[PDB]
Amino acid sequence: ILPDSVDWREKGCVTEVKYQGSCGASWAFSAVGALEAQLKLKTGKLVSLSAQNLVDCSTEKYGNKGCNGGFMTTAFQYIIDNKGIDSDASYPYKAMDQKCQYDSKYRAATCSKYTELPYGREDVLKEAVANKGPVSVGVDARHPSFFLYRSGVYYEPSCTQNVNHGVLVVGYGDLNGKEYWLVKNSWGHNFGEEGYIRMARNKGNHCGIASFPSYPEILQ
Numbered sequence: 001i002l003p004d005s006v007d008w009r010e011k012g013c014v015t016e017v018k019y020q021g022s023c024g025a026s027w028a029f030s031a032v033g034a035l036e037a038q039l040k041l042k043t044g045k046l047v048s049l050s051a052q053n054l055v056d057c058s059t060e061k062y063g064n065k066g067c068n069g070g071f072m073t074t075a076f077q078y079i080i081d082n083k084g085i086d087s088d089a090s091y092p093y094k095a096m097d098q099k100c101q102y103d104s105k106y107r108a109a110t111c112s113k114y115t116e117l118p119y120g121r122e123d124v125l126k127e128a129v130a131n132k133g134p135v136s137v138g139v140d141a142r143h144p145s146f147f148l149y150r151s152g153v154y155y156e157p158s159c160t161q162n163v164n165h166g167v168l169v170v171g172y173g174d175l176n177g178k179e180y181w182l183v184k185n186s187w188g189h190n191f192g193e194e195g196y197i198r199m200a201r202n203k204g205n206h207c208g209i210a211s212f213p214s215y216p217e218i219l220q
């Protein structure tokens with residue numbers, strides 16, 4: 001029996017909202033956000049991890065294009081292959097494509113594996129968010145209603161299931177019966193509800209939220 005509502009922020013597993021600026025690095029912020037929660041679950045410490053590390057180092061071999069887009073799954077594979085990712089403090093975000101500056105001396109997390117969830121299955125996504133932690137997802141954010149969102153449960157009839165923006169599902173619930181996914185964005189804390197958007201849940205894979213979910217794990 002899953003909880004009716006989940007909010008990983010209340011459990012100390014979510015870092016402060018980040019601001020990607022003019023660099024299309026949402027995939028990198030989605031990936032580090034998911035791994036940040038697993039690091040807290042494993043070690044008890046909450047540490048912001050380096051999105052810039054992914055932008056600069058998880059590149060053409062991983063199909064990623066830095067400030068021009070990428071995949072959360074191949075970001076996880078880079079962290080696995082590299083045997084680490086630096087802290088955000090040591091490798092801070094510059095919103096630019098740079099040469100790789102990874103230094104194992106400042107490693108703050110590792111990744112053992114990642115799991116992809118089946119396309120469009122919001123029931124499986126709910127289970128993963130409840131039982132595993134925050135889940136990286138793509139959404140279709142190419143709608144003014146999306147970036148103009150201020151509060152409430154977001155529903156856009158013109159939304160598609162084809163994703164183009166990486167975000168992090170940190171919980172779920174309902175607002176007076178309107179079910180939602182609790183989504184951490186990387187557009188700063190003045191977007192939406194202090195940086196978050198509550199997106200329609202169980203409305204036919206609204207905006208592609210459950211099209212391509214994935215989450216990392218840190219295993220002993």
Ligand SMILES: Cn1c(=O)n(C2CCN(CCCn3nc(-c4ccc(Cl)c(CNC(=O)c5ccccc5)c4)ccc3=O)CC2)c2cc(Cl)ccc21
Pocket residue numbers: 027060061062063064065068069070071072073074137138139163164165166167212
């Ligand atoms: C080593 N390696 C891989 O493992 N892949 C993977 C990448 C993930 N796909 C899974 C496809 C699932 N899928 N995901 C998205 C998707 C999910 C999240 C996000 Cl936010 C985005 C947005 N990202 C982009 O639109 C993007 C832009 C520029 C460069 C890369 C991605 C897309 C869209 C369609 C689709 O079938 C399998 C091959 C590789 C792909 C390439 Cl092109 C080159 C090397 C790769």
